Amino acid sequence: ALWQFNGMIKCKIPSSEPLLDFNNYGCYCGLGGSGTPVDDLDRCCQTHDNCYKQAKKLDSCKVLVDNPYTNNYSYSCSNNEITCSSENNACEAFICNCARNAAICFSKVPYNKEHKNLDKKNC
Ligand SMILES: [Ca+2]
Numbered sequence: 001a002l003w004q005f006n007g008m009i010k011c012k013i014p015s016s017e018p019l020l021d022f023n024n025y026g027c028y029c030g031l032g033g034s035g036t037p038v039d040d041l042d043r044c045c046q047t048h049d050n051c052y053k054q055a056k057k058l059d060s061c062k063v064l065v066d067n068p069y070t071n072n073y074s075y076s077c078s079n080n081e082i083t084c085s086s087e088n089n090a091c092e093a094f095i096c097n098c099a100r101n102a103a104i105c106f107s108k109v110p111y112n113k114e115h116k117n118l119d120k121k122n123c
Contacts, residue, residue: 002069005099011077012107022106026115027123035123038115044105051098061091071095 009018016022026042027035028049037043052068055061073092074085082103084096 001071001073001095004073004075004096005102007077008075008082008099008103009106011080011082012103014080018106021111024117026118027120035120038118038122039112040109041106041111042115044102044109047105048098048102051101052095055091055095055098058091058094060089061094064091066091066095068095075100 006018009022010016022041022045023030026038026045027033028037028042028045030045033046033049037046055066055068071092073088073096075096076083076085082100084093084100088096
């Protein structure tokens with residue numbers, strides 16, 4: 001959910017405050033997302049946006065009726081490695097994977113400050 005995602009990013013990027021650094025970045029990092037991603041990090045966010053959107057259409061999440069920020073799945077972080085919990089059911093596990101993928105993606109791409117707080121005209 002939101003706090004787990006934030007903790008997962010920190011796990012991979014220990015010097016960051018993801019709620020400050022990765023919010024409002026490019027066209028997809030933060031509320032909504034549309035247009036063409038401005039860079040690779042923006043693509044990470046785009047992918048993660050699509051993943052949560054896919055989660056919602058899942059039979060398992062739908063047999064229940066969650067919210068990608070109301071789902072208390074479990075994960076751990078050891079040595080900057082994120083492990084989604086075996087205990088997570090199919091829905092929780094799919095969402096946790098979306099987040100773990102996003103976090104690793106964030107840790108693998110350049111950060112371009114010029115793209116921080118981008119006017120959505122460019123999207
Ligand atoms: Ca977004």
